[PDB]
Design a protein around this ligand. Sequence first.
Ligand SMILES: Cc1cn([C@H]2C[C@H](O)[C@@H](COP(=O)(O)NP(=O)(O)OP(=O)(O)O)O2)c(=O)[nH]c1=O
Ligand SMILES: [Mg+2]
Ligand SMILES: [Mg+2]
Length: 430
Amino acid sequence: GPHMATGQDRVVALVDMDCFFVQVEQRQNPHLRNKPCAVVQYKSWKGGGIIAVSYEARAFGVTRSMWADDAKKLCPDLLLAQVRESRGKANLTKYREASVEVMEIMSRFAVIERASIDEAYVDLTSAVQERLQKLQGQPISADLLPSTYIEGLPQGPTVQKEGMRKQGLFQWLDSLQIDNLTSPDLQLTVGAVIVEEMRAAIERETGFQCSAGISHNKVLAKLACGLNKPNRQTLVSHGSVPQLFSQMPIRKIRSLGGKLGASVIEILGIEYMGELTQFTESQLQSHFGEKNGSWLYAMCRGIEHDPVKPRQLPKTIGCSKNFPGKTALATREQVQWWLLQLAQELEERLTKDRNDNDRVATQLVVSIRVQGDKRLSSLRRCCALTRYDAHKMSHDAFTVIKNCNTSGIQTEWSPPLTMLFLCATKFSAS
DNA sequence: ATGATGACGCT
DNA sequence: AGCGTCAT
Ligand SMILES: Cc1cn([C@H]2C[C@H](O)[C@@H](COP(=O)(O)NP(=O)(O)OP(=O)(O)O)O2)c(=O)[nH]c1=O
Ligand SMILES: [Mg+2]
Ligand SMILES: [Mg+2]
């Protein structure tokens, strides 16, 4: 009890842009706003692959990874925006630039870790301290939390969705201990006021809406984010964890959505995150390894220590294209041509990066998939990246992969390539 | 024929 | 180094 750490030491948020590529296209084209719409890449095979979906289209069953032609059977009035195509591949520059717009705004409030093109974690611990002093010991108005849900409330002795939100919020704030500058629940609340302000700023300055989770660590912040979407934010307190976890499938917790999560379920014969509390740390470590067992033991109690890394910029800059089915690359000249295309996009991105962010990449990773392999990558090789020159980079990547060709006739490439990937890495200051 | 990315762990 | 996992 008096020596048990409760993982209540930080305030962490996760901010996630709602249907982000869709919002980028809707800002640009007002005819798409407030409509069922999706973002598609390519167009020939089955209308293109959907990669993002507006909340109005999701109500019809439209999802990512559906073909647009199939999405149209569920939602006949679905509007589509197409990803730009440059040098015969998808080019995500518009979405990268929009993400930078958002991240720069977030960075005014606190330390951010870029988690993906449209998510960042935020460490609010310091911001909350500072804000607790100036606000003094005076109370926090619900009007400062207009889009916040307090997970697990209301509870105890209304018919509308906004009404439930306000009821829980009132219960929370009515129990808050406002004169104890170290109360975790108070710290979270202030964190949430800050996140409201951050979200208001993003929307005002970009037009983009997002959801957010506020809790004591990244895993709980991420989970919290997804609980009330879109355009809302959710506070998951330490106290809320036992009930929340008691029915929370294991696969919903970040890092457990794959093979390890499935093994936890199979080996232990459990279904929900809270059920982990029944095992000793050594038991868990015995099944899953020292690092994973320790992490699971703390996580199922709501405790997690992964720091929010101060990193707003990606650490690698890469370009790839899949060549599925009949388009698989089968001649030396095709392979070379496509490496050049990839290397030209890459050069463009790298030069821009070098001007914007004062750094230079030094390693080039070359990855390919071959026809028949159900892995992301059949093969990865590195080479020095000494000049930002597309012809050099493509020539080098070719060199590095060329003996993968089993074909006897030199013009041909067997087995055919179903993926090419160039990745610039090992950045240094410039 | 679920694409184009990106981070990190294991050995 | 190069492969495997998990994620958006
Ligand atoms: C998961 C995922 C996302 N994305 C892009 C499209 C989304 O617009 C953007 C953000 O991903 P997300 O946060 O997973 N999804 P979303 O932002 O579209 O939707 P949500 O509102 O966050 O659910 O990333 C992909 O291109 N491929 C993916 O597999
Ligand atoms: Mg999102
Ligand atoms: Mg996201």
